Design a protein around this ligand. Sequence first.
Ligand SMILES: [K+]
Ligand SMILES: [K+]
Ligand SMILES: [K+]
Ligand SMILES: [K+]
Ligand SMILES: [K+]
Ligand SMILES: [K+]
Ligand SMILES: [K+]
Ligand SMILES: [K+]
Ligand SMILES: [K+]
Ligand SMILES: [K+]
Ligand SMILES: [K+]
Ligand SMILES: [K+]
Ligand SMILES: [K+]
Ligand SMILES: [K+]
Ligand SMILES: [K+]
Ligand SMILES: [K+]
Ligand SMILES: [K+]
Ligand SMILES: [K+]
Ligand SMILES: [K+]
Ligand SMILES: [K+]
Ligand SMILES: [K+]
Ligand SMILES: [K+]
Ligand SMILES: [K+]
Ligand SMILES: [K+]
Ligand SMILES: [K+]
Ligand SMILES: [K+]
Ligand SMILES: [K+]
Ligand SMILES: [K+]
Ligand SMILES: [K+]
Ligand SMILES: [K+]
Ligand SMILES: [K+]
Ligand SMILES: [K+]
Ligand SMILES: [K+]
Ligand SMILES: [K+]
Ligand SMILES: [K+]
Ligand SMILES: [K+]
Ligand SMILES: [K+]
Ligand SMILES: [K+]
Ligand SMILES: [K+]
Ligand SMILES: [K+]
Ligand SMILES: [Mg+2]
Ligand SMILES: [Mg+2]
Ligand SMILES: [Mg+2]
Ligand SMILES: [Mg+2]
Ligand SMILES: [Mg+2]
Ligand SMILES: [Mg+2]
Ligand SMILES: [Mg+2]
Ligand SMILES: [Mg+2]
Ligand SMILES: [Mg+2]
Ligand SMILES: [Mg+2]
Ligand SMILES: [Mg+2]
Ligand SMILES: [Mg+2]
Ligand SMILES: [Mg+2]
Ligand SMILES: [Mg+2]
Ligand SMILES: [Mg+2]
Ligand SMILES: [Mg+2]
Ligand SMILES: [Mg+2]
Ligand SMILES: [Mg+2]
Ligand SMILES: [Mg+2]
Ligand SMILES: [Mg+2]
Ligand SMILES: [Mg+2]
Ligand SMILES: [Mg+2]
Ligand SMILES: [Mg+2]
Ligand SMILES: [Mg+2]
Ligand SMILES: [Mg+2]
Ligand SMILES: [Mg+2]
Ligand SMILES: [Mg+2]
Ligand SMILES: [Mg+2]
Ligand SMILES: [Mg+2]
Ligand SMILES: [Mg+2]
Ligand SMILES: [Mg+2]
Ligand SMILES: [Mg+2]
Ligand SMILES: [Mg+2]
Ligand SMILES: [Mg+2]
Ligand SMILES: [Mg+2]
Ligand SMILES: [Mg+2]
Ligand SMILES: [Mg+2]
Ligand SMILES: [Mg+2]
Ligand SMILES: [Mg+2]
Ligand SMILES: [Mg+2]
Ligand SMILES: [Mg+2]
Ligand SMILES: [Mg+2]
Ligand SMILES: [Mg+2]
Ligand SMILES: [Mg+2]
Ligand SMILES: [Mg+2]
Ligand SMILES: [Mg+2]
Ligand SMILES: [Mg+2]
Ligand SMILES: [Mg+2]
Ligand SMILES: [Mg+2]
Ligand SMILES: [Mg+2]
Ligand SMILES: [Mg+2]
Ligand SMILES: [Mg+2]
Ligand SMILES: [Mg+2]
Ligand SMILES: [Mg+2]
Ligand SMILES: [Mg+2]
Ligand SMILES: [Mg+2]
Ligand SMILES: [Mg+2]
Ligand SMILES: [Mg+2]
Ligand SMILES: [Mg+2]
Ligand SMILES: [Mg+2]
Ligand SMILES: [Mg+2]
Ligand SMILES: [Mg+2]
Ligand SMILES: [Mg+2]
Ligand SMILES: [Mg+2]
Ligand SMILES: [Mg+2]
Ligand SMILES: [Mg+2]
Ligand SMILES: [Mg+2]
Ligand SMILES: [Mg+2]
Ligand SMILES: [Mg+2]
Ligand SMILES: [Mg+2]
Ligand SMILES: [Mg+2]
Ligand SMILES: [Mg+2]
Ligand SMILES: [Mg+2]
Ligand SMILES: [Mg+2]
Ligand SMILES: [Mg+2]
Ligand SMILES: [Mg+2]
Ligand SMILES: [Mg+2]
Ligand SMILES: [Mg+2]
Ligand SMILES: [Mg+2]
Ligand SMILES: [Mg+2]
Ligand SMILES: [Mg+2]
Ligand SMILES: [Mg+2]
Ligand SMILES: [Mg+2]
Ligand SMILES: [Mg+2]
Ligand SMILES: [Mg+2]
Ligand SMILES: [Mg+2]
Ligand SMILES: [Mg+2]
Lengths: 118, 209, 114, 56, 123
Amino acid sequence: MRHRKSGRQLNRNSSHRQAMFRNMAGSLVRHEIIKTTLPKAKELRRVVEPLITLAKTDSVANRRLAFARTRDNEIVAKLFNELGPRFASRAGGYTRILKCGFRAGDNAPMAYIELVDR
Amino acid sequence: MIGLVGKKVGMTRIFTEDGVSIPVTVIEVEANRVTQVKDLANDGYRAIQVTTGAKKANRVTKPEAGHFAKAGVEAGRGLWEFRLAEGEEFTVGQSISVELFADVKKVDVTGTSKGKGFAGTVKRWNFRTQDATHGNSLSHRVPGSIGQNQTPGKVFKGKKMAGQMGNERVTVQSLDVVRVDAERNLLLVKGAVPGATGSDLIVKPAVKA
Amino acid sequence: SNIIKQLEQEQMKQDVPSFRPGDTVEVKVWVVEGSKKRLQAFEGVVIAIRNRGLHSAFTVRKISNGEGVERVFQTHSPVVDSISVKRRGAVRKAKLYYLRERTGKAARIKERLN
Amino acid sequence: AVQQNKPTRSKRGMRRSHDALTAVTSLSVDKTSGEKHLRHHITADGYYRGRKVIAK
Amino acid sequence: MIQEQTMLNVADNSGARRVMCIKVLGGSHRRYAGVGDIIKITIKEAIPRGKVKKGDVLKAVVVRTKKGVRRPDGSVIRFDGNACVLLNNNSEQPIGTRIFGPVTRELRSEKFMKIISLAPEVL
RNA sequence: GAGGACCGAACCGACUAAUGUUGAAAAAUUAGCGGAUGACUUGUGGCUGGGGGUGAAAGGCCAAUCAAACCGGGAGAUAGC
RNA sequence: ACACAGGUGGUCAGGUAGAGAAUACCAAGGCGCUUGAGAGAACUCGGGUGAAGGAACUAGGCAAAAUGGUGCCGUAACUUC
RNA sequence: GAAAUUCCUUGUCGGGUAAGUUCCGACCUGCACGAAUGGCGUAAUGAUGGCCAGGCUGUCUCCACCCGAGACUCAGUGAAA
RNA sequence: GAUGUCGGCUCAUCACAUCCUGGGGCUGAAGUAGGUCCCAAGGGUAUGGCUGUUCGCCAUUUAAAGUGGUACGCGAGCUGGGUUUAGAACGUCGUGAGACAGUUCGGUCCCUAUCUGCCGUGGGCGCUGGAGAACUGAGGGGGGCUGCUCCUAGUACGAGAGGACCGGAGUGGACGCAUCACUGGUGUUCGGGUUGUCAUGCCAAUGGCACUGCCCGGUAGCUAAAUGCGGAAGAGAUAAGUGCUGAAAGCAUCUAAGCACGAAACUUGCCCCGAGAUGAGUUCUCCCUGACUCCUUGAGAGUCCUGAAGGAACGUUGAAGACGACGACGUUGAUAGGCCGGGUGUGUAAGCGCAGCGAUGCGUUGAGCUAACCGGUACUAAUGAACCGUGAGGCUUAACCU
Ligand SMILES: [K+]
Ligand SMILES: [K+]
Ligand SMILES: [K+]
Ligand SMILES: [K+]
Ligand SMILES: [K+]
Ligand SMILES: [K+]
Ligand SMILES: [K+]
Ligand SMILES: [K+]
Ligand SMILES: [K+]
Ligand SMILES: [K+]
Ligand SMILES: [K+]
Ligand SMILES: [K+]
Ligand SMILES: [K+]
Ligand SMILES: [K+]
Ligand SMILES: [K+]
Ligand SMILES: [K+]
Ligand SMILES: [K+]
Ligand SMILES: [K+]
Ligand SMILES: [K+]
Ligand SMILES: [K+]
Ligand SMILES: [K+]
Ligand SMILES: [K+]
Ligand SMILES: [K+]
Ligand SMILES: [K+]
Ligand SMILES: [K+]
Ligand SMILES: [K+]
Ligand SMILES: [K+]
Ligand SMILES: [K+]
Ligand SMILES: [K+]
Ligand SMILES: [K+]
Ligand SMILES: [K+]
Ligand SMILES: [K+]
Ligand SMILES: [K+]
Ligand SMILES: [K+]
Ligand SMILES: [K+]
Ligand SMILES: [K+]
Ligand SMILES: [K+]
Ligand SMILES: [K+]
Ligand SMILES: [K+]
Ligand SMILES: [K+]
Ligand SMILES: [Mg+2]
Ligand SMILES: [Mg+2]
Ligand SMILES: [Mg+2]
Ligand SMILES: [Mg+2]
Ligand SMILES: [Mg+2]
Ligand SMILES: [Mg+2]
Ligand SMILES: [Mg+2]
Ligand SMILES: [Mg+2]
Ligand SMILES: [Mg+2]
Ligand SMILES: [Mg+2]
Ligand SMILES: [Mg+2]
Ligand SMILES: [Mg+2]
Ligand SMILES: [Mg+2]
Ligand SMILES: [Mg+2]
Ligand SMILES: [Mg+2]
Ligand SMILES: [Mg+2]
Ligand SMILES: [Mg+2]
Ligand SMILES: [Mg+2]
Ligand SMILES: [Mg+2]
Ligand SMILES: [Mg+2]
Ligand SMILES: [Mg+2]
Ligand SMILES: [Mg+2]
Ligand SMILES: [Mg+2]
Ligand SMILES: [Mg+2]
Ligand SMILES: [Mg+2]
Ligand SMILES: [Mg+2]
Ligand SMILES: [Mg+2]
Ligand SMILES: [Mg+2]
Ligand SMILES: [Mg+2]
Ligand SMILES: [Mg+2]
Ligand SMILES: [Mg+2]
Ligand SMILES: [Mg+2]
Ligand SMILES: [Mg+2]
Ligand SMILES: [Mg+2]
Ligand SMILES: [Mg+2]
Ligand SMILES: [Mg+2]
Ligand SMILES: [Mg+2]
Ligand SMILES: [Mg+2]
Ligand SMILES: [Mg+2]
Ligand SMILES: [Mg+2]
Ligand SMILES: [Mg+2]
Ligand SMILES: [Mg+2]
Ligand SMILES: [Mg+2]
Ligand SMILES: [Mg+2]
Ligand SMILES: [Mg+2]
Ligand SMILES: [Mg+2]
Ligand SMILES: [Mg+2]
Ligand SMILES: [Mg+2]
Ligand SMILES: [Mg+2]
Ligand SMILES: [Mg+2]
Ligand SMILES: [Mg+2]
Ligand SMILES: [Mg+2]
Ligand SMILES: [Mg+2]
Ligand SMILES: [Mg+2]
Ligand SMILES: [Mg+2]
Ligand SMILES: [Mg+2]
Ligand SMILES: [Mg+2]
Ligand SMILES: [Mg+2]
Ligand SMILES: [Mg+2]
Ligand SMILES: [Mg+2]
Ligand SMILES: [Mg+2]
Ligand SMILES: [Mg+2]
Ligand SMILES: [Mg+2]
Ligand SMILES: [Mg+2]
Ligand SMILES: [Mg+2]
Ligand SMILES: [Mg+2]
Ligand SMILES: [Mg+2]
Ligand SMILES: [Mg+2]
Ligand SMILES: [Mg+2]
Ligand SMILES: [Mg+2]
Ligand SMILES: [Mg+2]
Ligand SMILES: [Mg+2]
Ligand SMILES: [Mg+2]
Ligand SMILES: [Mg+2]
Ligand SMILES: [Mg+2]
Ligand SMILES: [Mg+2]
Ligand SMILES: [Mg+2]
Ligand SMILES: [Mg+2]
Ligand SMILES: [Mg+2]
Ligand SMILES: [Mg+2]
Ligand SMILES: [Mg+2]
Ligand SMILES: [Mg+2]
Ligand SMILES: [Mg+2]
Ligand SMILES: [Mg+2]
Ligand SMILES: [Mg+2]
Ligand SMILES: [Mg+2]
Ligand SMILES: [Mg+2]
């Protein structure tokens, strides 16, 4: 049973999952739209949107938290200097997912995820 | 004696003045609305059909809506029947409230038990595990033998095996009625009842008593 | 959750003092022996607190007549007549289970000055 | 464990009576580009619900 | 939560210092004895000139347990160790004259009133 | 500064367990295990040949073969089964 | 017999901790092991934690748990000293 | 000396355990020990056989939850007795 | 041209020659407690020490610790201690090789389930116009154990010792079902402490790796050791047994006619499944009220128009789930994520300042962070469509209106 539980295991261990979403969150902040599998995209929402919410309030402590969670100074700077202000008046829902068929190699269901104001 | 349809809100406790904590299941019993009365002449048996709660119109189909409209009542979230005793009479469109239980000491509560999915024999039937060690080969939670030999050369019906567990109708009998609060549409019974929070419950005066 | 909230709120006590893990508290509880009702005190260190509304509890440890004893009180129970803080303790942890392995000088808790 | 008797072609077919595929019930038509597409998916030219959502 | 092979301290001055449960009395397949339950014991250690000898088989009443006791409001009382009071095998009256450490009100009955009266504290 | 000395990697082994048993492997993997300056271990090359070799001896080993190797021949041995 | 968890003699020997060629994390350098995507049933495999009890398990404490370093104090019977 | 030997036999007595066909100490009625196909001892040694205890524990009472790899679903390839 | 062994473990199923519990006759049955026989198979029916043991003896329980059948039930379910390969030794026998249901130490347990069977779960068609619901209940399954204390009553009985039937109340053991409010376990998705090392330029702050590095706590969920509930009462027909009235047989006789009692067995009462119950049942409600052509002329075929109720599909999903299935929701919207507030958990973040040579302490500060929780909120994603399903539903005979 998994009654009421949240989060996807994605056939990985916890350290792999944490690292992969750190990288993928960085890619989405950098490029503003990426293509990935539909389940990974759904999971990435729960990682990326709290980072933007955090970047709404610029302070040394929040920059350090964002650096702890992304380990990329270019990504932290983009968060606090661009994305925070771009989304200062939006109450959540900073990304949108668009389904786009199936991968050639493995028939995996695919989706684009983008920032809403891209 | 008819019963009423309610909803499992959750569990809590009632502290009494002499220092006893009574665990209770909180059951929300909104007014039950009589939608059909069945009798010997037309249906061959005596019962009432009730609805309760509310439903959204675009999820109410035309056949359901016609049934409710004949009754003259608003659509609820489902329909349930209760058989009538010899001296019980009701009329279509009547409302029955939780005050029906005001003087009832004990109740039977029926619900759909929580769903465990496919369960093994240890959990489903309380089978004993075999050795964790002492040489056991791949057989720690497995069922063991399932029969005899050439006689009878088959497995008997009703053999206890792995399969779906829970998610089925269950009645718990003879629960104390701790509180009837008609103003808040509340029934408080002592102890646990089947089903997840939010689920539908059928509550009747206890058959054993 | 409002129905159960109302049911719980009407039962909560209104005069529970503030206390922290590491404090010494005296709890006065009702004891019935036949027809008589009297208060018995239980005083010791608070080693755990469960903050859970009407279901709040706290655990008190003492060494009694040569024997360690723990009582888990249900905070809003009418059996508990009163709680009073005798001494304020200075600890870091929320749960002081390590005190179970300590006696005498090793089990002392510094006073919290404030 | 293994069969004692060779199963028949008839029984093979009976087992496969559940194997057929099902075609997509119907495709959707983008209100701007007019392309057919799987419902709730973008079009091959990158439209969704009449908006050019992605380039190429 | 005492079972066969559980070792218990002795809350009296009978002379026994360590006893082992060898049977939970009072029912077929009965698993556990708690506070206020009678068990069969063997004496595994005793002081030299006491009232009982190492190797004796007799009865005892459990008076303190680590698992503890629950009260009608949900509260719990737990002790640091398991302890019992030795009883004569036939009369089920205590063998010692003194009781050491606190006991609980679960012993408040006609059977264990001597223990209740002798205990330094009753919780 | 002795030692078929001691603890312990490489190196040489193979005491226990799980796995594996149409294997990842026709003898292994994993966790533990023994020796580890010696009657030690290892590279290259040499010598011993089948009723024969070699054997700190288990009928062990002598090319995934051993109470008499392998290949060819007598040979279509013989077979009251 | 395989793009096979096996076997294969010699040489080189950085940093921090460390007695160390053990072990952990790294350097130079080299790699992610030639099916992937989901799900989060029973059961199997490899692991983590467990209330009270503590060998009651079992042929048998099998397996597991446990002990584990350096310095100092201290150490019985027996002995071929 | 009831033994790596004792059939009768779980011999009998003592010890250890609540309870001991095993174990230890004895007795001698040695079915069927016995002096280099050596007798009786023996410090040290042993992945050697038996027995007891402290510690320790999911071995067990009696199982529960969790983390991974399969199992299950989709796409590609595609065996076996 | 192979039907694997003793014992253990796991899982059982039947018989009754009944171990307990239920009912009864006789007793050399005062009572309590027994003996013996009859009826009775509903349910129940030890844990340990020794030994490979089955058995047995022993310890300590229990209402009791039943006897047998099922390939001496069960190794394509587990074990492998014993028996029964190859090594080795003792006693013994033999000149010897060797031997011994004598002993002793050591000694590889394979199989991915086609069919039957069984546990679960779907797809098809049927049930005669289609569709959405609520049911009836033929039939099937589950369940059915019992201790102790108190009252009756120190009464009946008994010289005393002792000590009841019948009836009533309470509280347990074992078993079962549900649940998570409490007490707890888990809680690699939350918070903190800390060792070694590498990195982010460095300080400070952080991250990776080392079993989650090692640990201390812990939310939701799952859960037992946690805590609610259950076994019944009642009814019908009976077993053994006990009778009433009563002749055959002037008496007697429970029986031949007639009538009455009588048990955990039987049929019900309680719980679950259940109309594929093809004997395919009932009730409520909803929907469809066009045109033409052809042939072998009929429950015929075809074309145009029409496309309902409803369903399905797709999407967002769920204490529902292996997949199917089942439930919720799709902008006329709280279905999921995010967001806002709260709770919970951890336990006083960072930065700055003060004290101290410094490690560190103190203030700002119960701070900061906080999963699966609670209350809200259209920010994001749940699309306008399209698809399936039709167009008043056979014959015969009655009854009735017509
Ligand atoms: K179960
Ligand atoms: K050499
Ligand atoms: K030879
Ligand atoms: K060869
Ligand atoms: K030869
Ligand atoms: K390393
Ligand atoms: K799955
Ligand atoms: K699954
Ligand atoms: K002898
Ligand atoms: K002999
Ligand atoms: K003995
Ligand atoms: K000789
Ligand atoms: K000699
Ligand atoms: K050895
Ligand atoms: K030895
Ligand atoms: K049987
Ligand atoms: K009987
Ligand atoms: K009798
Ligand atoms: K029976
Ligand atoms: K025997
Ligand atoms: K057989
Ligand atoms: K086997
Ligand atoms: K077979
Ligand atoms: K098997
Ligand atoms: K061996
Ligand atoms: K067959
Ligand atoms: K089927
Ligand atoms: K009773
Ligand atoms: K709980
Ligand atoms: K919990
Ligand atoms: K670090
Ligand atoms: K920095
Ligand atoms: K008569
Ligand atoms: K039907
Ligand atoms: K299902
Ligand atoms: K939401
Ligand atoms: K808090
Ligand atoms: K501070
Ligand atoms: K600070
Ligand atoms: K806080
Ligand atoms: Mg959720
Ligand atoms: Mg995979
Ligand atoms: Mg790691
Ligand atoms: Mg479920
Ligand atoms: Mg078991
Ligand atoms: Mg094996
Ligand atoms: Mg295993
Ligand atoms: Mg047959
Ligand atoms: Mg055949
Ligand atoms: Mg198929
Ligand atoms: Mg040496
Ligand atoms: Mg060798
Ligand atoms: Mg190895
Ligand atoms: Mg050595
Ligand atoms: Mg060594
Ligand atoms: Mg030759
Ligand atoms: Mg030989
Ligand atoms: Mg060879
Ligand atoms: Mg020859
Ligand atoms: Mg010839
Ligand atoms: Mg020939
Ligand atoms: Mg490869
Ligand atoms: Mg290779
Ligand atoms: Mg090498
Ligand atoms: Mg180095
Ligand atoms: Mg290394
Ligand atoms: Mg490099
Ligand atoms: Mg798993
Ligand atoms: Mg496991
Ligand atoms: Mg562990
Ligand atoms: Mg434990
Ligand atoms: Mg803990
Ligand atoms: Mg513990
Ligand atoms: Mg212990
Ligand atoms: Mg044992
Ligand atoms: Mg045993
Ligand atoms: Mg071991
Ligand atoms: Mg270990
Ligand atoms: Mg013998
Ligand atoms: Mg003997
Ligand atoms: Mg003896
Ligand atoms: Mg001897
Ligand atoms: Mg000899
Ligand atoms: Mg001789
Ligand atoms: Mg001589
Ligand atoms: Mg001689
Ligand atoms: Mg000689
Ligand atoms: Mg010799
Ligand atoms: Mg000797
Ligand atoms: Mg050696
Ligand atoms: Mg496939
Ligand atoms: Mg054959
Ligand atoms: Mg009979
Ligand atoms: Mg009787
Ligand atoms: Mg039966
Ligand atoms: Mg029967
Ligand atoms: Mg019955
Ligand atoms: Mg023992
Ligand atoms: Mg034994
Ligand atoms: Mg057999
Ligand atoms: Mg049998
Ligand atoms: Mg078999
Ligand atoms: Mg064997
Ligand atoms: Mg033989
Ligand atoms: Mg052995
Ligand atoms: Mg043997
Ligand atoms: Mg097998
Ligand atoms: Mg069907
Ligand atoms: Mg049938
Ligand atoms: Mg039945
Ligand atoms: Mg229970
Ligand atoms: Mg809760
Ligand atoms: Mg906890
Ligand atoms: Mg933890
Ligand atoms: Mg997180
Ligand atoms: Mg952490
Ligand atoms: Mg630093
Ligand atoms: Mg690294
Ligand atoms: Mg590394
Ligand atoms: Mg009758
Ligand atoms: Mg007469
Ligand atoms: Mg009964
Ligand atoms: Mg819409
Ligand atoms: Mg601080
Ligand atoms: Mg910190
Ligand atoms: Mg402060
Ligand atoms: Mg918050």
